[PDB]
C-alpha cells in the first residue's frame, strides 16, 4: 500500500486489481529517504506515467480514492526534494493529474477550495519548460480514446480560468490573489492558454468563451485572434468557424466597460472581413459608425467580382437597408468608378429602389380612400389628421386630398397639422408633391408652415437618389423671417435627408435660429434639426449646440417647455456612441443649475452606455431620491422644480432602453421583467410617479422592442382606461402597431368604443381616438418599426419624435409634429441579379417569445410561406433561407435580418 | 448551455436591484396618513368591532334594508349601514356583517371559497415549447385550435368563423400528452386552471353538481383561460359503480357537466383540454364536435420521431458518438416514445453495475436488450397467424 516494499515494479500487477498503488511509496518514500533515489525514480518515471493512462481507461471514483493516500501530499517541497534541479521538476508531471482527480471526479467540496492554489502553481512552473504543454497534449489529442481524458482535460483548463479571473476579482490580481496563486500573464502561463485554445476549438464549443469573459479584458481576444485566423479553414471549414466567432463575441461583450466594449467589436469585425462572409461584417460597420470601416468592408465586397453579378448588388442592398443612408453615400464612388452601369447602382445603393418595391406591394394590400373620424368640435380637426395616419406609407388617396373643402374646414393651428398629414398619405415618395405645393402659395401663414413640414415627410423616400432634392424647396423659407414658416421648414430638411451626410444639409443648417433673439419656442428646432444629421454614425458631439443650449436656458427659464426642447435634442444628437459623450458630459457639468441637472441625467443616459454595470445601477439611485425627500417631510422657482422631477422619471426608462438595445436579447426580457414589478413600486411611492410613469411605460415597451407582445400590453391598457392620462394610449399603441391587426385588433375595439361612450371632454376623446385608429393599418398596409434596417434595435433617427413629445405636456401644437412617423419596413423578396420581386419561399417562425435565443441564430423550424411578407417585430423576425428546389447557396445569409433575400440560383 | 449562462447573469442583477428599491418604495418612512387615508382608517376601526360573521345577500328591498342568510338557521332582516354602495351590491353577493348588530359594513369577499384557490394553478408550466422531442405535426394541431385565435385574431375575424371550443387529447400514454398540455400552456400565458375529476366523485350529497358550476364561473372571471379537466372520463364514461352509493351521485355529476358544456351557447372564450385514455373502446361522453371541435389522436411513435427524442438524451452521455445511433432505433419495432425514455434511464443504471461512471460503448447495445424484452412482455401485440 504505502509500504516501502510496494515501491517495486514487481507489485504493479498484484496491486492493479485493487487500484495501482505502486506509484504511492515510489514518489513518496524514495524521494524523502535518498536523493540518489531521485535519479533512480527517473528511470522508473516511464512506468509511473503509463499507470496514469491505465487509470483513465476505466473512470470510476474507487480507483482514485484508493490509489491516492499520500500522492496528494508529495509534489516537490513536501518531501524537501530539490536536489539535482532537474529531477524533482520532471516529477511534477505525474503528480499533477493526480490532484485533479480527487478534486472533482469523486465529489468533495473541501478539496476543490484547498488544492485550487496547489495545482495552478504546478502547471505554471512546468509550462515554462514547456513540458507541461506535453503532459496536457497527450490527453487533448486523444491518440488513445477513453472516458478519462474527457474529464481530465476539462480540469486543466478549469484552473486556467481561475488564473485569469484573479484580474477581475481584485486589483491585487496576479500571484497575490491566492485562489490560484499563479499570475495571469508571465513567460510560462501565456504559452499554455494558446496551445489549449487551438486544440479545444475543435473539441468544445463552450470552454473557450468561458476563459474570454472571466478575463474581462481584450487580452483574451488577442491570443484568440491569431488562433482563429490559423484555424479558420484548415481545421474546420470557413462557414462552420464563422459560426463559432458569432457565438463567442456576443457572450463576452455586454459585460465589459465602455473603452473595451468597443474593442471586442473591432476584433470581431476584422475576423469577419478576413473570412469570405461579409454579410455579418457590414452589420458591425453600422454599430461603430466609423466612416473608415464602412469604406473597407464595402470595397471588400465589390473587388472579388469585376462585373455586376451578385457582387455589386449585394454590396448595394446591404447598405440600402440601413435607411440612415450614411452607408449609401460611402458606397457610391467605388461603384460609380467601375461604371458597369452608373444609374442602376446609384439607385439600388440609394433608397430609390426601396420606393419602387413598395409600389408593387400596395396593389396587393389594396389602395384605399378610407378615412375614419367624426364631425364637429375638436373631432372636426381630428378626422382630417386621422385619414393621414390610416393611409400609412405610399397610398392613393388623391381624390380626397383634391377637395380643398376639408382642408379649409379645419380650424386654428389644426390647419397646420392637416396639410402635414397629406404628406403622410404620400409618405416615402415624391409623387404627391403637387397637391402640397398649392397650399404653400395660398392663404394663411398657418398652411404655409404646414405645406413645408408635409413636403419633409414625403421626400423621405430620397436622400441619395438626388432626384428632386429637399434642399431645392426648403432653402427659401428659412430666409422668410416669420418664425412658424421657418421652423417647419428647417425641421423638414432634417427628416428628408435623414441620417445622410451631404454638403447640402450642412450648409443649410450652418445658421441656426436657436437664440435668445426669438424667445419663441419654435426656434429651438434648429438644434433638433442637427440631431437627425449626426445620428446613426459617430458623433462629433458638435459644440455649436452646447453653446446655444446654455445661452437660451439661463436667459429664459420662465418657460420650462422651451428649454426642455433644447435639452432632449442634444440627448437625441448623442445616440450612436457613448465614448465622446463622456467627454462633453464634463462641459455641461461645469456650469450647474437645477436646470442643468435635467440635462445631466439625459445626456448621461447616452454617455454611460457601453456597460449595464454602471448604467443600470445609477438611474435607480436617481429614481430613489424623490421618494426619500418626501418621506422625510412626512415624518422661476416653480419652473426649476417641475423640470427636475419630470426628467428624472423620463431618464430612468431611457437608460434601461439604451442598455437593452446594445446588449444581448436576454437583457430585453429581463429589463422588461424589472419594469412591470417596478410599476407597483413607483405607484406606492408617489402620486406624481403614478401619472408620469404611465406615459413612459408605453414608450419602454416600444423603444425596448419587447419580445412579448401578448399579455403585457393588454394588461397595461386596461388598467389605464381608469387611470389619468390618455397620452399613455398614444405611446403604447406604436408598439402595438408594429404587429398590425394583432395587438391592435384588440386595441381598436376596446379603446375606440369605450372612449366615445364615456366621453366627458373632447380633448381626451381626441387622444384616445387618435391612438386607436393609428394603431390599426387597413389590411396590413405598411408598418413603422424602430428597426433602421439590419439593426432592429437600431438608433432611431425619425422615430425619436415619440421620445421628444411623450415627455412634454400634450398640445394642439404637438399634433402637427406627431404626423411624422417615418421608418417603413421592407417586404422580403428573393433577388438574384434580375431583381425579380417577391420571394420564392422563406421560413418565418411567428411563435417567438424565447429569451434563450441570444446568439442570433434563427429558430430553424419555421413555417414556410411563399408570399412576400413584411418583417413583423418579434413575431415574424426569425428568417431562414429556403430555396433548395432549384439548388442554391445563400450569398446573403440571414440572421433574422430584415434584409431581402439574395441567393445564387444554379 | 451557454445560452442558459447568459440569462443567469441578468436574472441575478434584476432580483438584487428590485429588492433594494422595494424598501423605500413600499414605504418604511413614506407612511401615507394624509386626510384621504386617515378618514378611511378611523371610521373602519370604530364601525368594525370584530369578529365579523359573513353572510350572503339574498335580496335587496329599496329602503336600505336587505335580507341576508347568516350561517345561523334564523335569517336576519338587516339594515344596510355605511360603506358599500347600494347599486354595487347585486343579489347573490357574499357580504361582511357586523357581529353586534348585523349591518352591511362592506364586501371584500366576492363569494371567496378555498375551492377556487385549489383549482387555481396558473403556476410556472414545467414545459416550454419544443423542449419536447415530440413531432411538429402533432403539436401543430392543438396549437391550431388554441393558440392561433389569440396570436392572430386577423385571420379568424376576416374569415368570420367562430374561434374553436375545446380539443380532446387522447393517445396512447407515453406520447407525452400532459407534456403537450403544459407546452401549450406556456405559450398562451393564460390562466391555467386545473381540476381532477375524481374530486367530483364522492358519496356527499349533491356536491358534484356544485363543483361543476364553479368551474365555468372561475374561467370566465380569469379569462382568457385554458381549463384542464384532467380525466374528464372519471365523471363520465369511467366508473365507480352504483352498488356503493353511486346510484345517486355519478348520474347527477355526468348530466351536470354535460349540460354546462353545451350551455345556452358555447362560450367560445374558454379553451378546454380534456384528458382521457381513448374513447374508442370506451363509451363517448364528450358529446359531439362544435363544443369539443378538433379531436387529437397522437400517433404511436415511428422510427423518425424517436430519432429526435433520442438526440436530447445522447448529449449528456459520453461514448455514444462511436455507437451508431441509427441502428438502435431501427432494430426495435415502432413503439412508445416512453420506451426510449425508459432506455436512457436504464442505461445509466446499468453502467454503474459494470463500473463505468457514464455509459461504455458496449453498455448502450446491451441497454436495448433489457428494455425491449421488459416492455414487449408488458404489452403484447396480436401474433401474426
Amino acid at each position: 500500500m504505502v509500504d516501502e516494499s510496494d515501491k517495486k515494479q514487481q507489485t504493479i500487477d498484484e496491486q492493479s486489481q485493487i487500484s495501482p498503488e505502486k506509484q504511492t511509496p515510489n514518489k513518496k518514500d524514495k524521494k524523502k529517504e535518498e536523493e540518489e533515489q531521485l535519479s533512480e525514480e527517473d528511470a522508473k518515471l516511464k512506468t509511473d506515467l503509463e499507470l496514469l493512462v491505465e487509470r483513465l481507461k476505466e473512470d470510476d471514483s474507487s480507483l482514485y480514492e484508493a490509489s491516492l493516500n499520500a500522492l496528494k501530499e508529495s509534489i516537490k517541497n513536501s518531501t524537501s526534494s530539490m536536489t539535482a534541479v532537474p529531477k524533482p521538476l520532471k516529477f511534477l508531471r505525474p503528480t499533477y493529474p493526480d490532484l485533479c482527480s480527487i478534486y472533482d471526479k469523486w465529489t468533495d467540496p473541501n478539496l476543490k477550495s484547498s488544492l485550487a492554489d496547489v495545482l495552478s502553481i504546478l502547471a505554471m512552473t512546468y509550462s515554462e519548460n514547456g513540458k507541461h504543454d506535453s503532459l496536457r497534449y497527450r490527453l487533448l489529442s486523444d491518440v488513445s480514446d477513453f472516458e478519462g481524458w474527457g474529464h481530465e482535460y476539462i480540469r486543466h483548463l478549469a484552473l486556467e480560468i481561475g488564473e485569469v479571473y484573479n484580474d477581475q476579482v481584485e486589483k491585487d490580481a496576479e500571484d497575490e490573489t491566492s485562489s490560484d496563486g499563479s499570475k495571469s500573464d508571465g513567460s510560462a502561463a501565456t504559452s499554455g492558454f494558446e496551445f489549449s485554445k487551438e486544440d479545444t476549438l475543435r473539441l468544445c464549443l463552450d470552454i473557450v468563451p468561458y476563459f474570454l469573459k472571466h478575463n474581462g479584458e481584450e487580452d483574451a481576444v488577442d491570443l484568440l485572434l491569431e488562433i482563429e485566423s490559423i484555424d479558420k479553414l484548415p481545421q474546420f471549414v470557413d462557414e462552420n468557424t464563422f459560426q463559432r466567432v458569432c457565438q463567442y463575441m456576443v457572450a463576452c461583450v455586454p459585460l465589459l466597460p465602455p473603452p473595451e466594449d468597443v474593442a471586442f467589436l473591432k476584433t470581431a469585425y476584422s475576423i469577419y472581413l478576413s473570412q469570405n462572409e461579409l454579410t455579418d461584417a457590414i452589420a458591425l460597420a453600422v454599430r461603430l459608425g466609423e466612416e473608415d470601416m464602412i469604406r473597407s468592408v464595402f470595397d471588400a465586397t465589390s473587388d472579388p467580382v469585376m462585373h455586376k453579378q451578385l457582387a455589386y448588388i449585394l454590396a448595394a442592398q446591404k447598405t440600402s437597408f440601413e435607411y440612415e443612408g450614411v452607408q449609401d453615400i460611402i458606397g457610391n464612388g467605388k461603384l460609380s468608378e467601375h461604371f458597369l452601369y452608373l444609374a442602376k447602382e446609384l439607385n439600388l445603393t440609394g433608397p430609390k429602389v426601396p420606393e419602387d418595391i413598395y409600389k408593387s406591394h400596395l396593389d396587393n394590400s389594396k389602395s384605399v380612400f378610407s378615412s375614419a373620424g367624426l364631425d364637429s368640435a375638436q373631432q372636426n380637426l381630428a378626422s382630417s389628421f386621422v385619414n393621414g395616419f390610416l393611409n400609412l406609407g405610399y397610398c392613393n388617396d388623391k381624390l380626397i386630398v383634391d377637395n380643398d373643402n376639408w382642408v379649409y374646414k379645419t380650424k386654428g393651428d389644426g390647419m397646420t397639422s392637416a396639410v402635414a398629414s397629406i404628406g403622410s398619405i404620400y409618405q416615402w415618395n415624391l409623387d404627391g408633391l403637387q397637391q402640397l405645393d398649392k397650399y404653400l402659395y395660398v392663404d394663411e401663414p398657418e398652411v404655409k408652415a404646414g405645406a413645408l413640414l408635409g413636403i419633409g415627410i414625403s421626400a423621405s423616400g430620397v436622400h441619395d437618389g438626388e432626384v428632386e432634392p429637399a434642399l431645392l424647396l426648403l432653402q427659401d423659407y428659412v430666409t422668410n423671417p416669420d418664425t412658424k414658416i421657418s421652423s417647419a421648414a428647417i425641421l423638414g430638411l432634417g427628416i428628408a435627408f435623414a441620417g445622410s451626410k451631404n454638403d447640402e444639409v450642412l450648409g443649410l443648417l450652418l445658421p441656426i435660429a436657436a437664440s435668445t433673439d426669438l424667445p419663441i419656442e419654435t426656434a429651438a428646432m434648429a438644434s433638433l434639426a442637427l440631431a437627425h444629421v449626426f445620428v446613426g454614425t459617430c458623433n462629433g458631439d458638435i459644440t455649436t449646440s452646447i453653446m446655444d443650449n446654455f445661452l437660451e436656458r439661463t436667459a429664459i427659464e420662465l418657460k420650462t417647455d422651451w428649454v426642455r426642447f433644447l435639452a432632449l435634442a442634444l440627448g437625441i444628437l448623442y445616440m450612436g456612441q457613448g465614448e465622446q459623450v463622456d467627454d462633453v458630459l464634463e462641459t455641461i457639468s461645469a456650469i450647474e443649475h437645477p436646470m442643468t441637472s435635467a440635462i445631466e441625467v439625459l445626456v448621461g443616459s447616452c454617455a454611460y452606455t457601453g456597460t449595464g454595470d454602471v448604467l443600470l445601477i445609477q438611474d435607480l439611485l436617481h429614481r430613489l431620491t424623490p421618494k426619500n425627500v418626501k418621506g422625510e417631510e412626512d415624518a422661476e422657482i416653480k419652473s426649476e422644480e417641475k423640470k427636475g422631477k419630470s426628467s428624472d422619471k423620463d431618464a430612468t426608462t431611457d437608460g434601461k432602453n439604451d442598455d437593452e438595445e446594445e446588449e444581448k436579447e436576454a437583457g430585453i426580457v429581463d429589463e422588461l421583467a424589472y419594469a412591470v414589478l417596478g410599476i407597483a413600486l413607483i405607484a406606492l411611492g408617489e402620486d406624481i410617479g403614478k401619472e408620469m410613469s404611465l406615459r413612459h411605460f408605453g414608450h419602454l415597451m416600444h423603444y425596448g422592442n419587447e419580445h412579448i407582445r401578448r399579455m403585457v400590453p393588454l394588461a397595461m391598457g386596461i388598467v389605464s382606461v381608469s387611470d389619468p392620462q390618455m397620452k399613455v394610449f398614444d405611446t403604447l399603441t406604436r408598439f402595438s402597431h408594429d404587429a398590425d391587426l394583432e395587438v391592435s385588433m384588440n386595441s381598436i375595439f376596446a379603446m375606440g368604443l369605450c372612449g366615445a361612450g364615456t366621453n366627458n371632454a373632447r380633448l381626451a376623446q381626441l387622444l384616445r381616438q387618435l391612438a386607436s385608429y393609428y394603431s390599426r393599418e387597413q389590411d396590413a398596409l405598411f408598418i413603422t418599426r424602430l428597426a433602421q434596417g439590419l439593426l432592429h434595435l437600431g438608433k432611431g433617427t425619425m422615430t425619436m419624435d415619440v421620445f421628444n413629445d411623450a415627455h412634454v405636456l400634450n398640445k394642439v401644437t404637438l399634433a402637427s409634429i406627431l404626423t411624422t412617423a417615418v421608418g417603413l419596413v421592407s417586404p422580403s423578396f428573393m433577388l438574384k441579379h434580375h431583381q425579380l420581386f417577391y420571394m420564392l419561399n422563406a421560413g418565418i417562425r411567428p411563435k417567438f417569445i424565447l429569451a434563450l435565443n441570444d446568439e442570433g441564430e434563427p429558430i430553424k423550424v419555421n413555417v414556410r410561406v411563399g408570399q412576400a411578407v413584411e418583417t413583423v417585430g418579434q413575431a415574424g423576425r426569425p428568417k431562414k433561407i429556403t430555396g433548395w428546389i432549384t439548388q442554391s447557396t445563400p450569398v446573403l445569409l440571414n440572421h433574422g435580418e430584415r434584409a431581402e433575400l439574395e441567393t445564387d440560383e444554379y | 448551455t451557454r445560452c442558459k449562462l447568459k440569462l443567469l447573469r441578468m436574472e441575478r442583477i434584476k432580483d438584487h436591484l428590485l429588492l433594494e428599491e422595494e424598501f423605500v418604495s413600499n414605504s418604511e418612512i413614506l407612511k401615507p396618513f394624509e386626510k384621504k387615508q386617515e378618514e378611511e382608517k378611523k371610521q373602519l376601526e370604530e364601525i368594525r368591532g370584530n369578529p365579523l360573521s359573513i353572510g350572503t345577500l339574498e335580496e335587496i328591498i329599496d329602503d336600505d334594508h336587505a335580507i341576508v342568510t347568516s350561517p345561523t338557521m334564523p335569517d336576519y332582516y338587516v339594515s344596510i349601514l355605511s360603506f358599500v354602495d347600494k347599486e354595487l351590491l347585486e343579489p347573490g353577493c357574499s357580504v361582511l356583517l357586523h357581529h353586534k348588530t348585523m349591518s352591511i359594513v362592506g364586501v371584500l369577499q366576492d363569494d371567496a371559497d378555498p375551492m377556487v384557490s385549489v383549482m387555481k394553478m396558473d403556476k410556472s408550466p414545467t414545459e416550454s415549447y419544443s423542449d419536447i422531442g415530440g413531432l411538429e405535426s402533432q403539436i401543430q394541431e392543438i396549437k391550431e385550435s388554441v393558440e392561433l385565435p389569440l396570436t392572430h385574431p386577423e385571420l379568424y375575424e376576416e374569415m368570420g368563423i367562430k374561434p374553436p371550443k375545446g380539443v380532446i387529447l387522447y393517445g396512447a400514454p407515453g406520447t407525452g400528452k400532459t407534456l403537450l398540455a403544459k407546452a401549450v400552456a406556456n405559450q398562451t400565458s393564460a390562466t391555467f386552471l386545473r381540476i381532477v375529476g375524481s374530486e367530483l366523485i364522492q358519496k356527499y350529497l349533491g356536491d358534484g353538481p356544485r363543483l361543476c358550476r364553479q368551474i365555468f364561473k372561475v374561467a370566465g372571471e380569469n379569462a382568457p383561460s385554458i381549463v384542464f379537466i384532467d380525466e374528464i372520463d372519471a365523471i363520465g364514461t369511467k366508473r365507480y359503480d352504483s352498488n356503493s352509493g353511486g346510484e345517486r351521485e355519478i348520474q347527477r355529476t355526468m348530466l351536470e357537466l354535460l349540460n354546462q358544456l353545451d350551455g345556452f351557447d358555447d362560450r367560445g372564450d374558454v379553451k378546454v383540454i380534456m384528458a382521457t385514455n381513448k374513447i374508442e373502446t370506451l363509451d363517448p361522453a364528450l358529446i359531439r364536435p362544435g363544443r369539443i371541435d378538433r379531436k387529437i389522436l397522437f400517433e404511436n411513435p415511428d422510427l423518425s420521431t424517436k430519432k429526435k427524442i433520442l438526440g436530447i438524451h445522447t448529449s449528456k452521455m459520453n461514448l455514444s458518438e462511436d455507437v451508431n445511433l441509427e441502428t438502435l432505433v431501427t432494430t426495435k419495432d415502432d413503439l412508445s416514445g416512453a420506451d426510449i425514455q425508459a432506455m436512457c434511464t436504464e442505461a445509466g443504471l446499468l453502467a454503474l453495475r459494470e463500473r463505468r461512471m457514464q455509459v461504455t460503448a458496449e453498455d448502450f447495445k446491451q441497454a436495448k436488450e433489457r428494455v425491449m424484452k421488459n416492455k414487449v412482455e408488458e404489452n403484447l401485440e396480436g401474433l401474426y397467424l
Partner: peptide, 11 residues
C-alpha cells in the same frame, strides 16, 4: 465548468 455551477446555485 465548475466555477459556473455555483452561478446556478446563487440564482
Amino acid at each position: 465548468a465548475a466555477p459556473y455551477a455555483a452561478k446556478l446555485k446563487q440564482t
